[PDB]
Each structure stands twice: as structure tokens, then as C-alpha cells.
A paper describes a structure:
In addition to the coordination bond between Mn2+ and [name], a hydrogen bond between Tyr122 and [name] helped locate the carboxyl group of [name] in the [name] active site, potentially explaining why the Tyr122 substitution reduced [name] lyase activity by >90%. The positively charged dimethylsulfoxonium moiety of [name] was located exactly where DMSP was in the [name]–DMSP complex and was stabilized via cation–π interactions to the side chains of several aromatic residues, including Tyr21, Trp26, Phe108, Trp110 and Phe117, which, except for Tyr21, also perfectly superposed onto the [name]–DMSP complex. The Tyr21 side chain moved ~1 Å away from [name] compared with that of DMSP, providing a wider substrate-binding pocket to accommodate the [name] dimethylsulfoxonium moiety, which is larger than the sulfonium of DMSP. Structural analysis also highlighted Tyr64 and Tyr122 as the probable [name] [name] cleavage catalytic residues, although the distance between the Tyr64 hydroxyl and the C-alpha of [name] was >4 Å. From these data, we proposed that the [name] catalytic mechanism for [name] mirrored that for DMSP29. When [name] binds to [name], it displaces the water molecule and forms a new coordination bond with Mn2+. Subsequently, the catalytic residue Tyr64 attacks the Cα–H proton of [name], forming a Cα carbanion. Consequently, [name] is cleaved into DMSO and acrylate, which is then released from the [name] active site.
Dimethylsulfoxonium propionate ([name]) is a recently identified and abundant marine organosulfur compound with roles in oxidative stress protection, global carbon and sulfur cycling and, as shown here, potentially in osmotolerance. Microbial [name] cleavage yields dimethyl sulfoxide, a ubiquitous marine metabolite, and acrylate, but the enzymes responsible, and their environmental importance, were unknown. Here we report [name] cleavage mechanisms in diverse heterotrophic bacteria, fungi and phototrophic algae not previously known to have this activity, and highlight the unappreciated importance of this process in marine sediment environments.
Residue numbers in the entry:
A (entry chain B), B (entry chain A): 1 to 126
């Protein structure tokens, strides 16, 4: 199994979102629930201006690849700005958040060492 | 740990290359041999015009995130063009290759579900 995905390829998948996290939306691009892939899973997320992926944690390690815009990464209390061209490593169960305070949409891929997103349990930090 | 890394952040690290992959060079941005991260590892690769990452396989699944240029992905014998904005899933042990026959550099990140790149044993294929 080898395959290529982009936003055009997942046009017929609806965006995921929740009232719990205003301004945040996501799609699944490499994911066992859609593709039968395994070992790694990847999604594409957008954070609108003012949106906040609030402080949370989850057991798998995570990489984010920032593809557009800029934001403020909350590294368990220590803030650092991120932007297009950055990659982010987040250790498993490390508390992190991401806020968009710019003009552009903050867009990024996330990657988990899991077969799929839906088996990752998200916990709010507080 | 949580950290951020971009090409500028690894200026200190010389490009890696190998004779078997002409016109291919890479750096390690998230890697236990460099960072003490764990669970996922990520590098950045450039394939110069004419360069060829020849047909090979390795046991871990792999994701590629194409950030610039165009390339010809060999999917175990079936070709597909990839370009900026694409992501690629390569199942563990699936045979794959990536050629650049364009005029601009083909740039991508790769991600493995390993702590470090040196945990990935590469095998040549057909
Ligand atoms: C934008 S998502 C799909 O909630 C996942 C983002 C994250 O885990 O940091
Ligand atoms: C650029 S590398 C790390 O030599 C090979 C990348 C790959 O496994 O496809
Ligand atoms: Mn997260
Ligand atoms: Mn490979």
C-alpha cells in the first residue's frame, strides 16, 4: 500500500470540528479508518484567527508540520512562536496548546505513531 | 520535551548523503540521536534536479510531506507524480523510489514511527 493525498483528494470528506474548539477544523489524510494504512497517521488542521487549540495531552508523541501562517505554541507553560516552515515535536503526554494570533489561517499537518486518529484519547489539561 | 525546528535551526548540521542516491541530501530535525525525542522521527530531504532516490524498502511505515518541487514517485511499480502540497503514505516494506526530473529542487519531510533514523534499515529492491 502506497498512496498520495492532498486537499483535492479529500474534497468529499467533510471537515471535522466541534463547538468545543471554536475556529478549529480538520480532515484525515492518512488514517486507518479511511485508508487501511497503519503505523503512522496524519491529518490536516486549520486554526482560524483567534482560534485556540487549548492546553491538552495524549499518550502518543506528535509531530506538527506548519504549512501556513503563524501561531503561539504553548510548551507546557513556555511559549514559542511557530510559523510556516517549522516542525514541532511534542513528547507523549506533554501538555501543549496552539493559538493563532495572525492574519492568515494557521494550517498544519499533525502526525501520530498510531494507525488512526480515532483511537487517540485527548485529555484537557484543566 | 517539546521543541521547534526549522532548516535555519540546523545550520550547524552538515548535509548527509550517500553514493547510492545521486543528487539526494538530507538533515535530521527530530531524531533521538540528536534530540532525545522518541516515538516519531523526522528529516528533511532535497532531491536536486536529476536526482534519484532509487527503489528500496524498510520495515517501518513512512510518511512524506512534499513542500516544494515535483517528483516521480515509484509506488512498487506504478508511477505517480507528486508535488508541493502532497503527503505520501508508504506501508512498511513496500518498495518505493522518488525521482526528480524537473528543474527545481524537490523538497520533502519524511517521518518514521521510530525514535531515530538509525533504527531504519534500508534494503535495495528490483
Ligand atoms: C487539530 S486536531 C485533529 O484536534 C489534533 C491537533 C493536536 O493533537 O495537537
Ligand atoms: C532522504 S533518506 C532518509 O535518505 C530516504 C527517505 C525515504 O526513506 O524515503
Ligand atoms: Mn496534540
Ligand atoms: Mn523510504
Amino acid at each position: 500500500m502506497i498512496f498520495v493525498k492532498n486537499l483535492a483528494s479529500v474534497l468529499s470528506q467533510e471537515w471535522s470540528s466541534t463547538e468545543k474548539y471554536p475556529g478549529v477544523r480538520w480532515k484525515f489524510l492518512i488514517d486507518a479508518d479511511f485508508d487501511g494504512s497503519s503505523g503512522l497517521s496524519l491529518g490536516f488542521a486549520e486554526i482560524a484567527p483567534g482560534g485556540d487549540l487549548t492546553l491538552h495531552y495524549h499518550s502518543p508523541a506528535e509531530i506538527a508540520v506548519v504549512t501556513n501562517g503563524k501561531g503561539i505554541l504553548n510548551k507546557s507553560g513556555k511559549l514559542e512562536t511557530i510559523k510556516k516552515g517549522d516542525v514541532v515535536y511534542i513528547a507523549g503526554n506533554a501538555e501543549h496548546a496552539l493559538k493563532n494570533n495572525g492574519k492568515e489561517t494557521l494550517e498544519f499537518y499533525w502526525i501520530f505513531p498510531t494507525d488512526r486518529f480515532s483511537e487517540v484519547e485527548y485529555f484537557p489539561a484543566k
